[PDB]
Structure 1
Amino acid sequence: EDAELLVTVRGGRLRGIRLKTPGGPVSAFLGIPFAEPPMGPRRFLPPEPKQPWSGVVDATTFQSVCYQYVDTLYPGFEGTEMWNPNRELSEDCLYLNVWTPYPRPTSPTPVLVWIYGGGFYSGASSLDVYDGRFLVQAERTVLVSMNYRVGAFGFLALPGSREAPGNVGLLDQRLALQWVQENVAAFGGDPTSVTLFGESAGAASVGMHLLSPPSRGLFHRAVLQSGAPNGPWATVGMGEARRRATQLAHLVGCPPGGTGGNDTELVACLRTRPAQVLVNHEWHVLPQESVFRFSFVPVVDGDFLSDTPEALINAGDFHGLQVLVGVVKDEGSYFLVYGAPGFSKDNESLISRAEFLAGVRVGVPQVSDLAAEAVVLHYTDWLHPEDPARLREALSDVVGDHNVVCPVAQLAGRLAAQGARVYAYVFEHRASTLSWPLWMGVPHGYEIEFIFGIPLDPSRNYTAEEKIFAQRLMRYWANFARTGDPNEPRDPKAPQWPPYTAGAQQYVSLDLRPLEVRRGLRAQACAFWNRFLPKLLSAT
């Protein structure tokens, strides 16, 4: 009988399970309840801490996935099914998972907390690509991941009211962080060295916890991968959030014909509807045809976010704080097959000049015709203005820069210039197991396999070079979690990773080649997005 598989926390006792890796076993505790089930009258409300239980709760398998839209654009396609839920859907989903080395570390170990992405409408901590058994075995750290409510169940906001205040999905993450502060020591983790890291909407979530005082004291380092809280998709206004929430209620028969429409009776009608009914009309509340836009996202409400993320980043002090930001090579190619005209994953997507002009309005929604004209000017090779391959490559850069690269570069510049020591990277390796077409390059979200050491899985057809490449990245992320510096402390031989500053703007490229230092996070393109375009919209 293994004795390290039974741990007592503040709520009660748990029974873990031993997982095998090619390098050794790891103890895992999957499915720990950190909150009461937010069902019935608790729907749309902030989470309550899990009451203590009797007996031993089985923590040997992942729990249910929160209710969310299921992608059916390409049924049976690996590139999309790998992000779909792998457990049953249920509103009873507020559970977290803890991986710890075997034997348990006798000394406090830094903790890595993972927040998944999925446009705030999907995602789960049980995805095979988020398996933290390889990162914990190789680097001997403590990895924690939680489930937070997505979609309307986590971000439907009627601002002002108390039945649906909004940002409760962010409160699910915060309550999970307080859980780590109160119980990670029982697994050998150091609550004084907590490193958040997420991707896409999870990276924006990490950024929003960085701008919220209550969540600020629950962690010490941050890693934002292909996402930022100041992105044009990450937040929404109080007025737009009320319109989307009321639009969703109307599509499901709320309120009934002849009944008033105040916030109390509107949420009361929404709480009676089945969960799947709300999901079926989630995308029907978006205002326009667009890519990289999602219905229910965090709302600027003055509570969790006292002001807009851009305002909080500008007027913030980030001294004594380390951040690791970065993007992939092709941030926008993934979203073009979700609405952009002429784009298909099954051909070369050699779009025409007319389709490229239509895609700009889809990639950059709610901009004046003059503003769209400026985007066409900057992203047109006027020496080959009709080349389909260049127009395809340009529209991918339009969506990538507007939503990811430039919001991230804006964040990294203000962080470094205001007390924070930040490190920047660009992931440029295309995996050999990638099922997406070649023209997509390195799509949004396909560095997570190497960060979690997935190539080390013997049942997968990765190459020997990619396995070594995965161990490098796991060492980088672990060194940042341990010392706040991705460079090996006992190593002057390997190429150095210089910090990112507002002036030099240095970053490194991550691929099979050794580290290469470059400058400028698309500075020429992002000067248009971060400087000129705001002024162009002010003058209408």
Structure 2
Amino acid sequence: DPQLLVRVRGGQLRGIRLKAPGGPVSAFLGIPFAEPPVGSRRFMPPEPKRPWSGVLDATTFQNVCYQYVDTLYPGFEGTEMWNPNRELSEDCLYLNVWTPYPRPASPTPVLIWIYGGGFYSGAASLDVYDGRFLAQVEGAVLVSMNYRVGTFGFLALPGSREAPGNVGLLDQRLALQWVQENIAAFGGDPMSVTLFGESAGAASVGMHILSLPSRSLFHRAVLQSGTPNGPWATVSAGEARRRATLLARLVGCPPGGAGGNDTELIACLRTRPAQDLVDHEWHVLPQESIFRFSFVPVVDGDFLSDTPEALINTGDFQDLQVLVGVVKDEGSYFLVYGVPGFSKDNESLISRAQFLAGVRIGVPQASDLAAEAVVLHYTDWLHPEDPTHLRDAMSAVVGDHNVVCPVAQLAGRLAAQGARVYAYIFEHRASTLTWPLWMGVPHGYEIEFIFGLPLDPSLNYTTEERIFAQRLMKYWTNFARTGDPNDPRDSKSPQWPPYTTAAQQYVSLNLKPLEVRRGLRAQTCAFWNRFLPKLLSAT
């Protein structure tokens, strides 16, 4: 079947024909995009996959990059669903392609997805990132690649030749240059590349916009629940180094009282079993905390010329179309992972003292005064001990601090600089959600919908959820083709207005039709984005 047989710039491939509810889909899973970054390649910028003979099989999902695996709640769908579903391996630089069966007629727009998992975990192989529905139904050419997370992706000794950092991003950039020079053959338009990701994938998409060289490889961008500018998606060189060598040292690299040879250091590191590194991953953070990750993009003054803050602050984004948004309760999920009093198993009605402590875990960089400021802001002084309030407060400190305000800081900075921005607030809690009611709509629970999982009848969502999904898919693909999530020409009732400095408009993405709103946590985010920082830089 020529539908499943495609010649790529480096060789032939055989896809597989998948069956989505509305029909058939072509799927080319496992395409090498680079030479496995193993052995003396570990910590190195990726290299273009060499051309192969014969027909490369591409009927299946490849190995997940090497990464920590979540224990915490073993056998629990809520956590497991995020875990690797393929074998772990340093040989994981592959991407996927879904195209409607049969290949489109003309150059369809492409949706390149970037998975997220703190920069330390994640995989395109995942169920919720099943690009079949968006290709099947909205007739889109969808691509999802794997990029090195953890030490392998980001361990860096800034200035070094052999562990220079951000290589997990270069992985994604490489997948992008490949989509450029080969998506054509799948019926995709190399001229309408729309990047889109969640958590650190969103953060990533952000970095592509902030990085010159990534510019020519995409035209539109979506950033769900995450940005390049907050407190957790980048570290300085100094800290990077501090956590590289510290990690090295815990692994015996270098052995003895040796030193001053970054090369020997990396050479040594390059011999340790992958799992040895993952074993010490979490011991290099400088404080007890949540929503803070050990190995993530570093401000090298290369891939990022300066901090994302400085960049979105003075960049020229005068033409960029960008969709951005957030969910009802970003912070909830993270509380279970480390804030005394919280669990998925009870209502986590915490004490005040617990909440006071939470604030220091959740805002680890905060001095005392700054912590005080945060407590002032989230305490309800008519009921400073209501456990239910405290509980939700904790979730807000975390969610606002890491996701919401940073989103809003980016939305506004973008708009003010030229961007056409759109914003939203996912508020629908999936019926199927396995987390406790108290977490409401946790970080990452919009994905099932954007991808169109409710369209699968076996999965069993509600018809509303299904319709909902379709609506959501429609907005994305529409922003994808046009650069406006809006019903074509067809001005079908509710409209989605561009987020603007002055009006500050965003929409409620939920079961009830679009419902425009103004100001994304405006006060709260003024707290965080405007004042808090000066407090911190004083203390």
Give ranges in structure 2 of 5+ residues lacking alignment.
none
Aligned to 1:536: 535
Distance in structure 2 (CA, Å) of the matches to 1:463 and 1:308: 44
Distance in structure 1 (CA, Å) of the matches to 2:314 and 2:460: 48
Distance in structure 2 (CA, Å) of the matches to 1:262 and 1:242: 13
SS state of the match for residue 189, structure 2? strand
Structure-to-structure mapping, 1:212-227, within 5 angstroms: 212-227=211-226
Q: CA offset at residue 461 of structure 1?
A: 2.0
Aligned to 1:338: 337
Distance in structure 2 (CA, Å) of the matches to 1:169 and 1:336: 27
Distance in structure 2 (CA, Å) of the matches to 1:388 and 1:331: 19
Distance in structure 1 (CA, Å) of the matches to 2:441 and 2:146: 27
Aligned to 1:184: 183
Aligned to 2:27: 28
Distance in structure 1 (CA, Å) of the matches to 2:523 and 2:258: 55
- What is the letter of the counterpart of residue 178 of structure 1? Q
Structure-to-structure mapping, 1:102-501, within 5 angstroms: 102-501=101-500
Aligned to 2:75: 76
Percent identical: 88
Q: CA offset at residue 490 of structure 1?
A: 2.7
Aligned to 2:511: 512
SS state of the match for residue 355, structure 2? helix
Distance in structure 1 (CA, Å) of the matches to 2:95 and 2:359: 40
- What is the letter of the counterpart of residue 12 of structure 2? R
Give the TM-score taking structure 2 as reference length: 0.99
SS state of the match for residue 272, structure 1? coil
Give ranges in structure 1 of 5+ residues lacking alignment.
none
SS state of the match for residue 516, structure 1? coil
SS state of the match for residue 193, structure 1? strand
Aligned to 2:64: 65
Q: CA offset at residue 430 of structure 1?
A: 0.3
Q: CA offset at residue 271 of structure 1?
A: 0.3
Give the TM-score taking structure 1 as reference length: 0.99
Contact 1:255–1:261 (CA under 8 A) maintained in structure 2: no
Equivalenced residue count is: 539
Q: CA offset at residue 492 of structure 1?
A: 1.8
SS state of the match for residue 3, structure 1? coil
Q: 1:185-219 deviations in whole A, cap 9, x for unaligned? A: 00000001100000000000000000111001110
Structure-to-structure mapping, 1:35-46, within 5 angstroms: 35-46=34-45
Distance in structure 2 (CA, Å) of the matches to 1:52 and 1:327: 41
Distance in structure 2 (CA, Å) of the matches to 1:104 and 1:61: 19
**Higher mean Cα deviation, 64-73 or 261-270?**
261-270
SS state of the match for residue 74, structure 1? coil
Distance in structure 1 (CA, Å) of the matches to 2:111 and 2:491: 26
Q: CA offset at residue 262 of structure 1?
A: 1.8
Q: CA offset at residue 457 of structure 1?
A: 1.4
SS state of the match for residue 366, structure 2? coil
- What is the letter of the counterpart of residue 321 of structure 2? Q
Distance in structure 1 (CA, Å) of the matches to 2:441 and 2:472: 16
Aligned to 1:101: 100
Distance in structure 2 (CA, Å) of the matches to 1:469 and 1:405: 23
- What is the letter of the counterpart of residue 8 of structure 2? V
SS state of the match for residue 375, structure 2? helix
**Do structure 1's residue 52 and structure 2's residue 24 form an aligned pair?**
no
Contact 1:157–1:166 (CA under 8 A) maintained in structure 2: yes
What RMSD, in angstroms, separates the aligned Cα atoms of the two structures? 0.7
Q: CA offset at residue 71 of structure 1?
A: 0.3
SS state of the match for residue 140, structure 1? coil
SS state of the match for residue 404, structure 2? helix
Contact 1:324–1:422 (CA under 8 A) maintained in structure 2: yes
Contact 1:424–1:506 (CA under 8 A) maintained in structure 2: yes
Q: 1:16-37 deviations in whole A, cap 9, x for unaligned? A: 0000011100000000000000
Q: 1:444-502 deviations in whole A, cap 9, x for unaligned? A: 00000000000111221211110000000000000000000100123223200011001
Aligned to 1:89: 88
- What is the letter of the counterpart of residue 115 of structure 2? Y
Q: CA offset at residue 258 of structure 1?
A: 4.2
**Higher mean Cα deviation, 186-195 or 251-260?**
251-260
Q: 1:372 to 1:258 in 2, by over 3 A?
A: closer
Distance in structure 2 (CA, Å) of the matches to 1:521 and 1:244: 35
Distance in structure 2 (CA, Å) of the matches to 1:366 and 1:50: 41
Distance in structure 2 (CA, Å) of the matches to 1:110 and 1:441: 34
Distance in structure 2 (CA, Å) of the matches to 1:425 and 1:372: 29
Contact 1:99–1:133 (CA under 8 A) maintained in structure 2: yes
Q: 1:208-252 deviations in whole A, cap 9, x for unaligned? A: 000111001110000000000001000001111001001111111
Give the ranges of 4+ consecutive aligned residues of structure 1 lying more than 2 Å apart after TM superposition: 258-261
Q: 1:389-422 deviations in whole A, cap 9, x for unaligned? A: 0000111000001000000100000111111101
**Do structure 1's residue 527 and structure 2's residue 526 form an aligned pair?**
yes
**Higher mean Cα deviation, 109-118 or 486-495?**
486-495
Distance in structure 2 (CA, Å) of the matches to 1:318 and 1:515: 27
Contact 1:33–1:96 (CA under 8 A) maintained in structure 2: yes
Distance in structure 1 (CA, Å) of the matches to 2:525 and 2:43: 37
Distance in structure 1 (CA, Å) of the matches to 2:359 and 2:270: 38
